[PDB]
Symmetry: D3
Subunit: 260 residues, 6 copies
Amino acid sequence: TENLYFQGAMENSFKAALKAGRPQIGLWLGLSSSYSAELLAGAGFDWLLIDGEHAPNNVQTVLTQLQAIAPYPSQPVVRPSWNDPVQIKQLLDVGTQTLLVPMVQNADEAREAVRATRYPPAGIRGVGSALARASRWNRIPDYLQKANDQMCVLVQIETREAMKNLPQILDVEGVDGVFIGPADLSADMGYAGNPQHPEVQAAIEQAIVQIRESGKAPGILIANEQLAKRYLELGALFVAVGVDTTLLARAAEALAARFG
Amino acid sequence: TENLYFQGAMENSFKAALKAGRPQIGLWLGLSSSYSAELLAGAGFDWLLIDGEHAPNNVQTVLTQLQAIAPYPSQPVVRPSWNDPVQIKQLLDVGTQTLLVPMVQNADEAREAVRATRYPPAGIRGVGSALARASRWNRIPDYLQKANDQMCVLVQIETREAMKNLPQILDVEGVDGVFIGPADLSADMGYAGNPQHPEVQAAIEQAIVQIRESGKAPGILIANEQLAKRYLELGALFVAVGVDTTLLARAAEALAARFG
Amino acid sequence: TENLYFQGAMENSFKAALKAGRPQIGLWLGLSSSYSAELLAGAGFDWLLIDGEHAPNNVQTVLTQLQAIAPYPSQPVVRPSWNDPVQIKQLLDVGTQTLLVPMVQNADEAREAVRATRYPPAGIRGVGSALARASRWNRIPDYLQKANDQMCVLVQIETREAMKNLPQILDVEGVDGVFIGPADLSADMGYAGNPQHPEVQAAIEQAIVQIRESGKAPGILIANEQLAKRYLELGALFVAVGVDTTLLARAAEALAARFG
Amino acid sequence: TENLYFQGAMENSFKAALKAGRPQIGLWLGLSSSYSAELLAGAGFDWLLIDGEHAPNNVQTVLTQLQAIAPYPSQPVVRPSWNDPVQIKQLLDVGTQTLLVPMVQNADEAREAVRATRYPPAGIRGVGSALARASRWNRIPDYLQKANDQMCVLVQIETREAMKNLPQILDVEGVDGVFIGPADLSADMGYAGNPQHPEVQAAIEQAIVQIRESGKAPGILIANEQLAKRYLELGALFVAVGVDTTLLARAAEALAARFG
Amino acid sequence: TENLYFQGAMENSFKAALKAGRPQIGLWLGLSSSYSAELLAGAGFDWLLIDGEHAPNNVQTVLTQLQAIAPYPSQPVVRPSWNDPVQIKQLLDVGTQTLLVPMVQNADEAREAVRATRYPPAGIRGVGSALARASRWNRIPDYLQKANDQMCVLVQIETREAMKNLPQILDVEGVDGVFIGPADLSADMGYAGNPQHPEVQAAIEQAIVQIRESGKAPGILIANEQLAKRYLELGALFVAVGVDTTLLARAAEALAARFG
Amino acid sequence: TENLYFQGAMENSFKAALKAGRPQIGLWLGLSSSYSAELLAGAGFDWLLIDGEHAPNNVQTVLTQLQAIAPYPSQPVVRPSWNDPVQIKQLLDVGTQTLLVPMVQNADEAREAVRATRYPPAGIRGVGSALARASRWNRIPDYLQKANDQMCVLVQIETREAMKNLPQILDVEGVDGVFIGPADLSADMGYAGNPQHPEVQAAIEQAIVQIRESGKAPGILIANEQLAKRYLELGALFVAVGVDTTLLARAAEALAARFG
Ligand SMILES: [Mg+2]
Ligand SMILES: [Mg+2]
Ligand SMILES: [Mg+2]
Ligand SMILES: [Mg+2]
Ligand SMILES: [Mg+2]
Ligand SMILES: [Mg+2]
């Protein structure tokens, strides 16, 4: 069984599902807890986003959430605080295989994101596999030779500039998905973080169509179910449909109010 | 403003509301996190139960949850793992003023629970108020003289033995409320922790009525809203109407299912 | 896949292996770290002992070690600090199914250990399965009805008194295995925690044989490999053959010495 | 009350006091503990500086110190390790509203500090308010529209270069205060971190006068009471008068020595 | 140097100083922080009391405080939450050699405290020295044979019952010192934790004299310096003269007040 | 003794041993635990590398590992995640005196590493010694004047570019040692992280010879003992001969396999 476990651990199931065009339904994790992460790992989502940008996470809390999530069918995705090669290196060594990189503005930045995930000559990933949960402390055989192909890089387009540079970003080898962040986008477009305006919606839907056309996976986070279904219909392949903090806050609030 | 903060830290608002016959709507906290505790402190509940019996909490995590909840209107209640004077002492020194004591079987045990919370001569509470958050490290004036009166002891009746001893338990001075645990009770009655059986409901209803007629506050945890309203109708004064882990688990499950 | 994950979370593989007379090779975990626990879960042991008696562990660190170990074939066993029903309750709710109970002196104490692990009417286990990782927050169907049968209670015999009471201890229903602690035993016999004396070895051998003849599983911790094989030869079924702190300390020492 | 709490939480009282020219007396927090932070929150200071530059703090320990301090009249100020937009973003999302930015050398850097705190179009603050304690997980109404005006940016001038560029820094919109760091300044001036030299004192006092003249708030940390009063007389508006580690170390040392 | 480090780790310097009649000046540690413990270990105290009774400490935080204090001349003493053999065992295995045991009421209880600290046949201390920091994971040679003699047991007398039993308590072999808790004592005597009353002072003075005449070490905690010197004058040998939380709280308060 | 402790703490024994040409045998610490660090501090190594680049460490876990290691003869060395002046500043303030800086490509970068460790005018180290464990909260006398000379900067050459720039790096004042990272080097040379190729070995041995020739200390990490002895023979002065995670994983694996 250990052998079975290790020859099984390497494979990036999320990446494989995106390549095959299987839509993946996700939940955002901002509770920054390995305990609630495990609870939510059993809810039935295809993927769970561990947010190191907008939730108080770091490399150490990412590690314990990956450990919590590990035995479940739900697949972890991790958002670094920015497109930082050092931070990406550290997240990969604790076992991150799927990265959601915020604020990717152009093809150079997208390329930098991809190269941060890959060992030389294909990138600049630093080698420390004996030390790393990524290789299970060198129990995964041929880890150094197998690692690059199982990395999944998803880049966020969150500004008008990023939207303008989209065709070039879609040309970058190793960018597997492009995620539209509606809150940051509408803010950049002058709608103060509220995406429910026709101009923001048009830019979002056009982008999803262009992304899918290139053969890459479109992604988005949207709490409105009707909009989520509509993005799915247009070809989005990684769609986060809620946020743990929001689910908890709204369920508790609605419950308290039912009792006055 | 510091004088003003301290001369109001002392006051037990939950105990005052129970004495006045104001019904208090509660949420159970099993997430064991100061982060989600603060989030839930903003939802509008009268009280929040920090569970040290059935959730992975200790004195240390109780402390950080009390700190998180402090500026909000919601009032903290703490459940020790058992009727243990040592643990009760430690919970009180970190600032706990309202205790929900599990598995109180008779009047002697209820009396022991009360005495654990009170300084001599009215009890056996150990003195270390310079060290303790309870007195805000001695910034609350005359803490040793004001502490006993602001302690609020709630005892759980969870077995047929406990239900038989209810009249005597209710005669114990310092027992402010009596809480029925329907799952433990139904388990003891032969229904395996499933309270939705006529015999269990009848015992619960009779106990609520009996508690309230003796001038004490009846308490209960119940996830079913219609049962909750019925118990409120009957005179229950501290009613927890959901559990954070359950709210979170069920909302995430339903969300995932809506997308298949 | 979630249904499939849950309908297999319930099953105690260690208990099943012991019942079938399959010898189980174990490693003791005193490092008190979810990080090294995961590392050691990949090494190939049948079972890992999370020590809450002689290592700085608590319910909280047990929980994170269980999460770390979960996806691996190695099965977790937990040692509480003593035969304490409250601590046992808390360990079970975080997901512990196999307990190694220290200093069990007689059949009454063995019976108390068994009853602490079982829901009424077969025991006194407190009910809080909505809150607990044990039921995966109620995602395991019919948890309350399936829990008792998957509990595996191992009792330590560590004194001459305990050895005398062995026949009666072995007659206790629910005692699945009997573990001999050679250090505590030799200490009680007047050999100061050093088990390598003929009189101690003879008592150990006789107990192993006696345990196995009664149809129960004999257990032991032994760092000496040849003694371990001998005890296996004699019928021992759960044998811990080293301790993580010792493995680490001795390998580092020998390495340093090779370089002067 | 929840409504009252939220419509009350948004307001930056420290910023309002500085605009009104009310001098604010502060204590530096380097103990990196939510426990001692709460203790010191009751001491009567107008503000408390949570030091992420010279004390072992990070985003997570800042969060728990803010939670500890929250119910007290003392107002939190947070120093990031440097003028880092990513780190500033993370500190703001956990609820930081007043920032003390070290090593601001010129007006460009001061402008970058200001823009890191503001949502587009006024800055580059990333939007993730559903996830954030800053908005109380979206319970503060109109958070996105109200947030920019409640941010308070204080910049540190700590070198001869910064002193030379002071007139231009004072022209930067959104810089509410300018803090002189005497230890770093004297070091840059060739006095090895000791500010008690006439040339350092002259540069400090001249700067305080120039700062106040521009209508912005001068600030400083000084352990000497006589110098503190003298800086206050010259118009300094945010003056930290001690450091928790120093208060503790000196009180304990003086106590031990009194007993030989 | 490792041999040299280990052959000096074993020795209890506090116990040796008490036996020689050298007065030891102490500081109480309620901050529950390994960081402030190290800071205070440099202040010049003979001993530091890590409080597990009235401060939010556990075995885990005791361990990190012992590690922090280790390289300094100040000697650690640990107070368990009560006279509990299980907790005492766990405290000893993490390296505690000097215990201050609260609420010892009679000679039987004093004897139980002593026996909890000693390996058979002189006591009931459980054997797990390979796992324990106490033996430095077996690097201290002949640990099992040297441990008992380096244990130092101090018992608190805190009630009128305890004062009556003092002669018998003092006849217990292994009781190295007797500590009077003036707050608990005055509370029991009817003075509500306020020891500054003639009757309480007289009982304290008489006990100090009685303890010292029996050849044992008298101990006390007292924040008032002149009372401390008086008790020293009378023969007290372990005298804690302040509390870290109090030192910190009072220095910060006085500082704030000097600035209004 | 406090005086003795402080006037003793300042001295960098590792730096002194390198200047005197005493070879130093090391162990890498990737377990990221203050507990196992203390265990390994007693194993007999001259130095221990706390890895903040490839192990999940941060400033806070470095701090607790330094505290754990402090009383032992083994000397701590710390690797930051990169040549980052802010991170270096924070590591120095918690007490790091010996730094191993990864990915130093040229003499400019080496100079930046050196200047990050030194107070003005010799570098850009920020001054906050009252707050810092580095000065023992200002108990080390003349800390500001003594600190620069006790800093020990070791730079890693890990690419073909770094190897080409070696002569210039060796000319940089304050670079005390040059460490070859074989895994990163062979990766850069096209051998995918496996250093056991003649071309990698030749580049390594030539570099060691050039380093020692310049009068600076060569260093390396190598798990093969025969290669370690061979690098030592050529003049390497800081040689790490194993990794804690590897020692633990391989000892546990070999043990499990001996029992089938
Ligand atoms: Mg965004
Ligand atoms: Mg119950
Ligand atoms: Mg034993
Ligand atoms: Mg400065
Ligand atoms: Mg006392
Ligand atoms: Mg490297």
